[PDB]
Tab-separated table of C-alpha atoms in Angstrom:
chain	number	residue	atom	x	y	z
A	1	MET	CA	-10.036	-0.781	11.394
A	2	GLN	CA	-10.837	2.713	12.645
A	3	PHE	CA	-13.249	2.909	15.617
A	4	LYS	CA	-13.405	-0.872	16.117
A	5	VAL	CA	-12.654	-2.300	19.579
A	6	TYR	CA	-10.336	-5.310	19.961
A	7	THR	CA	-9.046	-7.690	22.613
A	8	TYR	CA	-5.416	-6.950	23.516
A	9	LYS	CA	-3.310	-10.119	23.321
A	10	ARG	CA	-0.542	-9.129	25.749
A	11	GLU	CA	-0.158	-9.646	29.494
A	12	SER	CA	-1.303	-6.266	30.842
A	13	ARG	CA	-3.794	-4.557	33.123
A	14	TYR	CA	-5.319	-3.258	29.878
A	15	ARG	CA	-7.574	-5.781	28.098
A	16	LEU	CA	-9.255	-3.803	25.252
A	17	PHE	CA	-8.331	-1.001	22.844
A	18	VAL	CA	-9.984	1.097	20.146
A	19	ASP	CA	-8.273	1.494	16.774
A	20	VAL	CA	-8.081	5.217	15.910
A	21	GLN	CA	-5.776	5.292	12.871
A	22	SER	CA	-7.163	6.365	9.475
A	23	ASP	CA	-8.156	3.484	7.216
A	24	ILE	CA	-6.370	5.194	4.296
A	25	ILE	CA	-3.035	5.206	6.176
A	26	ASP	CA	-1.257	1.860	5.820
A	27	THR	CA	1.462	1.006	8.339
A	28	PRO	CA	2.323	-2.642	7.655
A	29	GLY	CA	2.290	-4.690	10.851
A	30	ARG	CA	1.092	-1.888	13.142
A	31	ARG	CA	-2.004	0.150	14.114
A	32	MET	CA	-2.407	3.207	16.362
A	33	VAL	CA	-4.937	2.451	19.123
A	34	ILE	CA	-6.282	3.935	22.403
A	35	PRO	CA	-6.449	1.533	25.378
A	36	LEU	CA	-9.531	1.291	27.598
A	37	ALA	CA	-9.455	1.397	31.412
A	38	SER	CA	-12.422	0.497	33.619
A	39	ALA	CA	-14.326	3.743	34.208
A	40	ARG	CA	-14.675	2.989	37.921
A	41	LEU	CA	-10.898	3.521	38.121
A	42	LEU	CA	-11.027	7.266	37.358
A	43	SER	CA	-12.834	10.160	39.087
A	44	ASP	CA	-15.066	12.846	37.570
A	45	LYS	CA	-12.162	15.304	37.854
A	46	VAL	CA	-10.780	13.550	34.740
A	47	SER	CA	-11.881	15.385	31.577
A	48	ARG	CA	-14.491	13.487	29.562
A	49	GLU	CA	-13.562	15.648	26.564
A	50	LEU	CA	-9.995	14.329	26.626
A	51	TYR	CA	-10.776	10.881	28.080
A	52	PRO	CA	-14.247	9.843	26.779
A	53	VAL	CA	-16.457	7.351	28.595
A	54	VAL	CA	-17.881	4.571	26.468
A	55	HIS	CA	-20.326	1.822	27.409
A	56	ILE	CA	-19.841	-1.677	26.013
A	57	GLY	CA	-22.453	-4.184	27.172
A	58	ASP	CA	-22.413	-4.240	30.984
A	59	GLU	CA	-19.079	-2.423	31.289
A	60	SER	CA	-18.161	1.269	31.287
A	61	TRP	CA	-14.719	2.264	29.984
A	62	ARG	CA	-12.536	5.340	29.859
A	63	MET	CA	-10.587	5.931	26.659
A	64	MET	CA	-7.014	6.606	27.819
A	65	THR	CA	-6.289	8.952	24.922
A	66	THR	CA	-2.892	10.187	26.072
A	67	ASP	CA	-1.655	6.588	26.558
A	68	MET	CA	-2.377	5.759	22.898
A	69	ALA	CA	0.151	3.610	21.030
A	70	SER	CA	0.824	1.793	17.802
A	71	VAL	CA	0.823	-1.932	18.473
A	72	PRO	CA	2.036	-4.974	16.536
A	73	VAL	CA	-0.664	-6.778	14.585
A	74	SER	CA	0.344	-9.868	16.619
A	75	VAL	CA	-1.331	-8.389	19.730
A	76	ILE	CA	-4.573	-7.431	17.993
A	77	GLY	CA	-7.237	-9.915	19.072
A	78	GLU	CA	-10.818	-10.362	17.936
A	79	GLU	CA	-13.198	-7.461	17.374
A	80	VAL	CA	-15.562	-7.085	20.337
A	81	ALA	CA	-17.386	-3.817	19.603
A	82	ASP	CA	-17.787	-0.795	17.289
A	83	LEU	CA	-17.497	2.830	18.459
A	84	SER	CA	-18.087	4.539	15.096
A	85	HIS	CA	-21.138	6.230	16.625
A	86	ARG	CA	-18.699	8.079	18.927
A	87	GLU	CA	-16.530	9.377	16.067
A	88	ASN	CA	-17.141	13.022	16.932
A	89	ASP	CA	-16.134	12.610	20.591
A	90	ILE	CA	-13.071	10.538	19.652
A	91	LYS	CA	-11.936	13.069	17.053
A	92	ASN	CA	-12.475	15.854	19.585
A	93	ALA	CA	-10.394	14.022	22.223
A	94	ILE	CA	-7.452	13.369	19.906
A	95	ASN	CA	-7.545	16.870	18.452
A	96	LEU	CA	-7.552	18.308	21.987
A	97	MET	CA	-4.417	16.313	22.862
A	98	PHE	CA	-2.467	17.704	19.898
A	99	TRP	CA	-3.974	21.151	19.245
A	100	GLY	CA	-5.540	22.237	22.549
A	101	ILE	CA	-9.040	22.523	21.088
B	1	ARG	CA	-8.602	30.407	27.921
B	2	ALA	CA	-5.614	28.035	27.919
B	3	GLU	CA	-4.948	28.794	31.582
B	4	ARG	CA	-8.622	28.142	32.270
B	5	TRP	CA	-8.238	24.703	30.619
B	6	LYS	CA	-5.045	23.869	32.523
B	7	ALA	CA	-6.642	24.945	35.819
B	8	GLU	CA	-9.922	23.102	35.471
B	9	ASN	CA	-7.880	20.010	34.637
B	10	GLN	CA	-4.694	20.096	36.772
B	11	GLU	CA	-6.175	17.695	39.346
B	12	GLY	CA	-7.548	15.279	36.746
B	13	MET	CA	-4.327	15.195	34.728
B	14	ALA	CA	-2.290	14.519	37.865
B	15	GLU	CA	-4.750	11.723	38.684
B	16	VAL	CA	-4.349	10.130	35.240
B	17	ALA	CA	-0.557	10.325	35.476
B	18	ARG	CA	-0.631	8.521	38.838
B	19	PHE	CA	-3.007	5.942	37.356
B	20	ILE	CA	-0.664	5.243	34.434
B	21	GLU	CA	2.344	5.016	36.782
B	22	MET	CA	0.520	2.427	38.919
B	23	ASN	CA	-1.245	0.532	36.122
B	24	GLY	CA	1.570	0.532	33.575
B	25	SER	CA	1.785	2.593	30.377
B	26	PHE	CA	0.306	1.008	27.275
B	27	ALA	CA	2.701	3.166	25.254
B	28	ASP	CA	5.730	1.787	27.103
B	29	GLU	CA	4.399	-1.783	26.590
B	30	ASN	CA	4.379	-1.232	22.812
B	31	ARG	CA	6.994	1.314	21.650
B	32	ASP	CA	9.286	-0.276	19.023
B	33	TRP	CA	12.013	2.381	19.140
C	1	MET	CA	7.349	21.692	24.837
C	2	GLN	CA	5.402	21.630	21.581
C	3	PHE	CA	7.472	21.770	18.356
C	4	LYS	CA	10.820	21.657	20.173
C	5	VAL	CA	13.275	18.942	19.085
C	6	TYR	CA	15.015	16.880	21.782
C	7	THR	CA	17.654	14.188	21.955
C	8	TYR	CA	16.604	10.706	23.063
C	9	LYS	CA	18.468	9.249	26.051
C	10	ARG	CA	18.227	5.587	24.929
C	11	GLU	CA	20.021	3.473	22.331
C	12	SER	CA	17.754	3.374	19.265
C	13	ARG	CA	17.637	3.761	15.495
C	14	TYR	CA	16.044	7.165	16.262
C	15	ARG	CA	18.207	9.820	17.937
C	16	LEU	CA	16.007	12.951	17.878
C	17	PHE	CA	12.292	13.588	18.189
C	18	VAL	CA	9.907	16.532	17.920
C	19	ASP	CA	7.425	17.115	20.761
C	20	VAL	CA	3.943	17.354	19.163
C	21	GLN	CA	1.660	17.430	22.220
C	22	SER	CA	-0.266	20.613	23.068
C	23	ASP	CA	1.333	22.797	25.756
C	24	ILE	CA	-2.094	23.132	27.404
C	25	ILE	CA	-2.325	19.337	27.798
C	26	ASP	CA	-0.009	18.578	30.695
C	27	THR	CA	0.576	14.852	31.266
C	28	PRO	CA	3.011	14.908	34.161
C	29	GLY	CA	6.050	12.810	33.350
C	30	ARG	CA	5.340	12.061	29.652
C	31	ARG	CA	5.084	13.706	26.219
C	32	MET	CA	3.837	12.613	22.786
C	33	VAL	CA	6.663	12.908	20.215
C	34	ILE	CA	7.535	12.069	16.584
C	35	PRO	CA	11.024	10.697	15.810
C	36	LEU	CA	13.252	12.170	13.083
C	37	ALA	CA	15.348	10.239	10.564
C	38	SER	CA	18.094	11.704	8.376
C	39	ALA	CA	16.318	12.863	5.199
C	40	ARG	CA	18.768	11.226	2.786
C	41	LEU	CA	17.572	7.836	4.107
C	42	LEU	CA	14.152	8.195	2.434
C	43	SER	CA	13.435	8.169	-1.296
C	44	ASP	CA	11.509	10.876	-3.140
C	45	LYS	CA	8.408	8.753	-3.572
C	46	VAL	CA	7.724	9.057	0.172
C	47	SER	CA	5.081	11.727	0.674
C	48	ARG	CA	6.305	14.977	2.229
C	49	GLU	CA	2.677	15.534	3.316
C	50	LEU	CA	2.697	12.558	5.697
C	51	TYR	CA	6.493	12.698	6.285
C	52	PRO	CA	7.639	16.338	6.189
C	53	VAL	CA	11.249	17.318	5.559
C	54	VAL	CA	12.513	19.746	8.214
C	55	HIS	CA	15.855	21.486	8.712
C	56	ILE	CA	18.114	21.812	11.757
C	57	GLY	CA	21.012	24.080	10.871
C	58	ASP	CA	22.382	22.964	7.503
C	59	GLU	CA	20.943	19.427	7.595
C	60	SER	CA	17.651	17.830	6.593
C	61	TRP	CA	15.470	15.421	8.567
C	62	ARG	CA	12.271	13.496	7.838
C	63	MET	CA	9.508	13.531	10.443
C	64	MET	CA	8.529	9.868	10.888
C	65	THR	CA	4.902	10.661	11.668
C	66	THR	CA	3.597	7.083	11.726
C	67	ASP	CA	6.224	6.200	14.388
C	68	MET	CA	4.789	8.746	16.825
C	69	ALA	CA	4.839	7.590	20.448
C	70	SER	CA	4.793	8.970	23.942
C	71	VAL	CA	7.968	8.794	26.035
C	72	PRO	CA	8.719	9.295	29.743
C	73	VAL	CA	10.535	12.507	30.665
C	74	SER	CA	13.478	10.376	31.874
C	75	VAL	CA	14.445	9.751	28.221
C	76	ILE	CA	13.897	13.348	26.999
C	77	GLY	CA	17.280	14.988	26.456
C	78	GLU	CA	18.755	18.252	25.184
C	79	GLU	CA	16.615	20.763	23.224
C	80	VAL	CA	18.482	21.026	19.935
C	81	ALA	CA	15.990	22.860	17.710
C	82	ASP	CA	12.641	24.617	17.481
C	83	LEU	CA	10.313	23.654	14.613
C	84	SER	CA	7.417	25.954	15.529
C	85	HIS	CA	7.762	27.593	12.097
C	86	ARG	CA	6.661	24.230	10.619
C	87	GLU	CA	3.552	23.883	12.796
C	88	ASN	CA	1.325	24.047	9.717
C	89	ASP	CA	2.965	21.080	7.956
C	90	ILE	CA	3.245	19.184	11.256
C	91	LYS	CA	-0.501	19.642	11.815
C	92	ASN	CA	-1.226	18.477	8.288
C	93	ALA	CA	0.849	15.325	8.721
C	94	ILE	CA	-0.706	14.365	12.058
C	95	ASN	CA	-4.216	15.107	10.791
C	96	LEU	CA	-3.577	12.857	7.789
C	97	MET	CA	-2.483	10.004	10.110
C	98	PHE	CA	-5.753	10.069	12.079
C	99	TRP	CA	-8.361	11.558	9.721
C	100	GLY	CA	-7.077	10.836	6.212
C	101	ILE	CA	-8.680	12.937	3.466
């Protein structure tokens, strides 16, 4: 569901992602999502407009917008957070990637 | 304005690309075609 | 480069894709693309808003918007067409995928 954060059930250095696909667009078995990387892993030279920083509990995360991907429903784990309050920033990031913005 | 955006961000974008190369691409992990 | 169509240097059901990433967003070594399928393979119920029909020479192709994915430059082949004249419909399709109506 759009703007919800889920555990990623695949062996990977990524552990969480945020669903960013429209809820009115049905793609059976798949959802487009943006993976999260620990914010400590990226410097301030990295655009926050394109790669937003989000805080979930005691962790800070960068949204790796350009590494977005549709994933199989089989790797979508439990919901762990909601980022709907960051809709404007997320929309701005995705629209920047495609349309420069 | 576009060149201003590219310039402000050239270092950061190079940094992200290196990060993805090292960390693994989520996209590559999941592409089904 | 945005709106150019390239061959795909991997065995796959998809053989061509259109680059849809902004030219001001430079992700060294990767680009976001949408694969094309021969248009005759889709029925007329399938929305041309979400899945536009585009032409390369005499032949028709459907843009498989919901199969968008980034690819490494190592698999990006020959430029075979330029769809910049369809930027408006391409924008509409991508905006539908993320933001619905």
